[PDB]
């Protein structure tokens, strides 16, 4: 069923809450035993948001390999993503260790450091060129190279140096700065423009490691970003674009990380973003 007609059907009958609860009921339940070990309590922001064991990213260290991060591997679309929580004061070094070890080119951030009067993630990158950051627990140095502030997003160029080997790499930081404190955006236009800027940079392409994407918990706004990107790519690849079923794509992604898409409003907004984005994919 053409999702555009499915959309109007759900909208007129006002059944978004019902559709969303059906997804919650059918979603996968896999173990997350490593996340729940006592030694990892201060590595998790939220007690009820954990990576599954089978898809969790492992740090390359013998001490403690745990980070709250998951590999989402989309086989038909030929895209992979790492979805993670916003870094905590005690996990900023682990976060950049992961970026290095996984050979990522881009980091996508969908939250502000403070929202609703409370801290949603650590200030984990430098704000001035001349004030670099050193992460002594993981032996990395991080420098701000340039910053481009736009009305709806900011793009930063960063240098990450492995201090053990003195290799360096350029990392791109794509920061969507205008998601509202409550609810979802009225129009998907600025979010789609942002997605296309991430695509244009190479950060999602197979010559690099998976993009790292986060918000506060790494499941809501972050799920919206990867769901929209994968659905648009599938409509480009298939003979019949109307065969792309957003609910089936979402359930496939939920095999790899729990809780993706946190509200019925985020589900509706994901539909709207794919519907409006297709009017470029299909040749306009």
From Swiss-Prot:
Enzyme class: hydrolase
Major subcellular site: endoplasmic reticulum
EC number from the UniProt entry: 3.1.3.48
UniProt PTM: Oxidized on Cys-215; the Cys-SOH formed in response to redox signaling reacts with the alpha-amido of the following residue to form a sulfenamide cross-link, triggering a conformational change that inhibits substrate binding and activity. The active site can be restored by reduction. Ser-50 is the major site of phosphorylation as compared to Ser-242 and Ser-243. Activated by phosphorylation at Ser-50.
Keywords: Acetylation, Endoplasmic reticulum, Hydrolase, Membrane, Oxidation, Phosphoprotein, Protein phosphatase, S-nitrosylation
PTM-bearing positions, type Cysteine persulfide: 215
Catalytic reaction equation(s): O-phospho-L-tyrosyl-[protein] + H2O = L-tyrosyl-[protein] + phosphate
Membrane topology type: Peripheral membrane protein
Residues in the signal sequence: none
Effect of residue 181 to A: Substrate-trapping mutant
Protein name, entry field: Tyrosine-protein phosphatase non-receptor type 1
């Amino acid at each position: 069923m053409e999702m555009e007609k499915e959309f109007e059907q759900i909208d007129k009958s006002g059944s978004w809450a019902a559709i969303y609860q059906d997804i919650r009921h059918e979603a996968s339940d896999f173990p997350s035993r490593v996340a729940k070990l006592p030694k990892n309590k201060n590595r998790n922001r939220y007690r009820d948001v954990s990576p599954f064991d089978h898809s969790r990213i492992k740090l390359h260290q013998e001490d403690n390999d745990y980070i709250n991060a998951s590999l989402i591997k989309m086989e038909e679309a030929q895209r992979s993503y790492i979805l993670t929580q916003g870094p905590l004061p005690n996990t900023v070094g682990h976060f950049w260790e992961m970026v290095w070890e996984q050979k990522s080119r881009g980091v996508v951030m969908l939250n502000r450091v403070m929202e609703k009067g409370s801290l949603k993630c650590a200030q984990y990158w430098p704000q001035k060129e001349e004030k670099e950051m050193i992460f002594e627990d993981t032996n990395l140095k991080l420098t701000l190279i340039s910053e481009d502030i736009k009305s709806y997003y900011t793009v930063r160029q960063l240098e990450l140096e492995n201090l053990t080997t003195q290799e360096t790499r350029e990392i791109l930081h794509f920061h969507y700065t205008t998601w509202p404190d409550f609810g979802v955006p009225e129009s998907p236009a600025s979010f789609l423009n942002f997605l296309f800027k991430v695509r244009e940079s190479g950060s999602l392409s197979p010559e690099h490691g998976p993009v790292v994407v986060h918000c506060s918990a790494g499941i809501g706004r972050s799920g919206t970003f990867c769901l929209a990107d994968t659905c648009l790519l599938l409509m480009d690849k298939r003979k019949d674009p109307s065969s792309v079923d957003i609910k089936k794509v979402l359930l496939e992604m939920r095999k790899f990380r729990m809780g993706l898409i946190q509200t019925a409003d985020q589900l509706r907004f994901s539909y709207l973003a794919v519907i409006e984005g297709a009017k470029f994919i299909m040749g306009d």
